[PDB]
Amino acid sequence: TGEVQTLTEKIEEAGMPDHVKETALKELNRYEKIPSSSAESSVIRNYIDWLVALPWTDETDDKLDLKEAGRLLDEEHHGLEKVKERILEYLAVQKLTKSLKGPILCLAGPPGVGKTSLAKSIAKSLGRKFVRISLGGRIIQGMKKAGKLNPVFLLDEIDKMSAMLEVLDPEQNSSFSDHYIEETFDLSKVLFIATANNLATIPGPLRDRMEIINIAGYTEIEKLEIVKDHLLPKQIKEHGLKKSNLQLRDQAILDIIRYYTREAGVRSLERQLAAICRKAAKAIVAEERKRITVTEKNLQDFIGKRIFRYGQAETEDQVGVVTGLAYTTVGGDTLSIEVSLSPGKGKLILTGKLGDVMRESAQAAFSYVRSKTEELGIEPDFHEKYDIHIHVPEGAVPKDGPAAGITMATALVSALTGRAVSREVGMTGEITLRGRVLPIGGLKEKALGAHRAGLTTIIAPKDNEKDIEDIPESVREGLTFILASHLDEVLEHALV
Amino acid sequence: TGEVQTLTEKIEEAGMPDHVKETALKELNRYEKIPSSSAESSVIRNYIDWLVALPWTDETDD
Numbered sequence: 001t002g003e004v005q006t007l008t009e010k011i012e013e014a015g016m017p018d019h020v021k022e023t024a025l026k027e028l029n030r031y032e033k034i035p036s037s038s039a040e041s042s043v044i045r046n047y048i049d050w051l052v053a054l055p056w057t058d059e060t061d062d063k064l065d066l067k068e069a070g071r072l073l074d075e076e077h078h079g080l081e082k083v084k085e086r087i088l089e090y091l092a093v094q095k096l097t098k099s100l101k102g103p104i105l106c107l108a109g110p111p112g113v114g115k116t117s118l119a120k121s122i123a124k125s126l127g128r129k130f131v132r133i134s135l136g137g138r139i140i141q142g143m144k145k146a147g148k149l150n151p152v153f154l155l156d157e158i159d160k161m162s163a164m165l166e167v168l169d170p171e172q173n174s175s176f177s178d179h180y181i182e183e184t185f186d187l188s189k190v191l192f193i194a195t196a197n198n199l200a201t202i203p204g205p206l207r208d209r210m211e212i213i214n215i216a217g218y219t220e221i222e223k224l225e226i227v228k229d230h231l232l233p234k235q236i237k238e239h240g241l242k243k244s245n246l247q248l249r250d251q252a253i254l255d256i257i258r259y260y261t262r263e264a265g266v267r268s269l270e271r272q273l274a275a276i277c278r279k280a281a282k283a284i285v286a287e288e289r290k291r292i293t294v295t296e297k298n299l300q301d302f303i304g305k306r307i308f309r310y311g312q313a314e315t316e317d318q319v320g321v322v323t324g325l326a327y328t329t330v331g332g333d334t335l336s337i338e339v340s341l342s343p344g345k346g347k348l349i350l351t352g353k354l355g356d357v358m359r360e361s362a363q364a365a366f367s368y369v370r371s372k373t374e375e376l377g378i379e380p381d382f383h384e385k386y387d388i389h390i391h392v393p394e395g396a397v398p399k400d401g402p403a404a405g406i407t408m409a410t411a412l413v414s415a416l417t418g419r420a421v422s423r424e425v426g427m428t429g430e431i432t433l434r435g436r437v438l439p440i441g442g443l444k445e446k447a448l449g450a451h452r453a454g455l456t457t458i459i460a461p462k463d464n465e466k467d468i469e470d471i472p473e474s475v476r477e478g479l480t481f482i483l484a485s486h487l488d489e490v491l492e493h494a495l496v
Numbered sequence: 497t498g499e500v501q502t503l504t505e506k507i508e509e510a511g512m513p514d515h516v517k518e519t520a521l522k523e524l525n526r527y528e529k530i531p532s533s534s535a536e537s538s539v540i541r542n543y544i545d546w547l548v549a550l551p552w553t554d555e556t557d558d
């Protein structure tokens with residue numbers, strides 16, 4: 001007998017068609033079964049098995065019926081309207097170009113917005129098998145975990161990396177190599193997708209090889225529905241218990257959000273739900289009560305006390321301290337800029353991010369007040385006998401650095417003139433020497449997160465109005481957008 | 497058997513005509529297959545492959 005058949009037999013099997021390989025197959029095969037399992041006989045010994053699973057003939061039979069798909073996406077993700085409209089473009093386009101083409105997409109946005117799920121769901125539609133392949137530190141494995149050569153790899157994180165191009169280059173990806181198994185391989189039909197946050201760390205080389213889609217975040221309205229029609233039931237069912245077991249009134253869901261999550265995604269939101277799904281269950285087993293109704297009053301009796309600040313209830317207006325909306329790798333954020341006055345020379349030293357990008361802007365809001373002075377109410381003998389300190393908290397992403405111009409400006413003035421920025425207002429805008437207010441980046445996400453922390457007024461660049469169009473209904477409805485072109489306009493509205 | 501042929505074989509192949517090179521070829525080749533893949537045996541190990549693809553005969557007709 002001998003295991004000279006256990007393998008060989010299943011080798012000539014229907015599986016393993018291509019002969020270009022079978023050569024290298026029986027080759028290292030008819031090798032040295034002579035002798036026993038020497039230190040040598042353990043080596044190539046295994047080389048054969050990895051080789052047994054790798055698909056060739058196998059493959060999936062794609063179904064591409066948009067009428068579905070597009071509205072299976074609406075079964076497993078709430079909003080993301082625009083983001084879907086673009087997943088289908090990537091399919092209606094697919095159908096025609098019968099062979100998947102180079103541009104493979106990255107999903108980008110704060111974590112907890114659905115990137116990973118969208119993928120799984122892209123694939124559910126295409127009826128291809130799905131594989132996560134984490135790149136926090138090897139496709140080798142990939143196929144194995146799916147023994148069907150028409151998959152959906154999700155290069156999850158390409159940006160927590162310390163070059164691989166080869167694997168995606170439309171020209172090359174066809175013929176694929178890999179050490180410790182050296183042999184070409186065809187990846188023609190392999191839907192690739194990428195997750196990502198800080199689009200930086202991604203290698204310029206790659207970012208061009210790939211087409212990008214931004215998932216944005218969510219309006220209170222959106223989150224709320226996400227909770228009700230997906231999040232909750234999922235967690236109920238997962239903590240094994242009945243829909244008739246536990247219900248949360250809308251208002252409380254809102255509260256959970258406003259007061260226990262300041263995220264753009266809904267991860268924190270899911271966790272706090274589960275919190276309750278849990279608490280709930282222990283009742284259902286002990287007390288046995290077939291129902292548990294968490295309300296806007298109950299809330300504390302489940303998830304603890306309040307966790308974040310919303311609105312202006314707590315806050316009082318301050319001096320030389322403005323609240324600028326900034327574009328963090330993880331959504332709209334509310335970094336506050338401060339300025340301090342100490343005797344000295346016209347020199348101005350700033351803290352926080354070392355920022356060489358900032359100084360330019362800073363010493364411009366600065367070089368503004370230099371001019372229009374008495375006109376503004378401030379002792380002209382100042383840049384001569386004061387020393388100004390500015391703090392610009394880190395978070396704003398490179399492109400958006402200069403978007404803090406009107407902010408530092410506003411502060412520096414409110415600081416010099418003992419006035420006071422209105423705690424309610426969040427601002428963003430680029431400054432110029434003359435006092436001009438130039439166009440700013442991603443107003444959408446900015447006002448989205450400006451609403452999240454519950455501000456009223458949000459001063460931004462005049463030349464940005466055509467950007468307010470796409471700002472989701474719910475939030476554009478709770479904000480009064482003061483648009484401005486020169487500092488004085490900003491200053492008048494943001495100071496009191 | 498040993499991989500003492502997997503490479504060598506395709507080396508004397510029709511590909512690799514010029515002898516000015518084949519010297520340096522079998523030279524670092526008949527090297528130290530002794531011993532196993534030591535920290536050393538990984539070095540020149542590869543030097544041979546880059547050398548396998550290089551063109552010589554293949555003169556595309558213009």
Ligand SMILES: Nc1ncnc2c1ncn2[C@@H]1O[C@H](COP(=O)(O)OP(=O)(O)O)[C@@H](O)[C@H]1O
Pocket residue numbers: 076077078079080110111112113114115116117118226230231265266267270
């Ligand atoms: N719009 C959404 N609708 C439903 N679930 C969502 C949505 N966004 C996030 N989720 C939750 O997250 C999953 C997909 O996103 P997730 O993987 O959590 O964040 P990320 O996409 O950044 O990894 C969903 O299964 C659900 O848990």
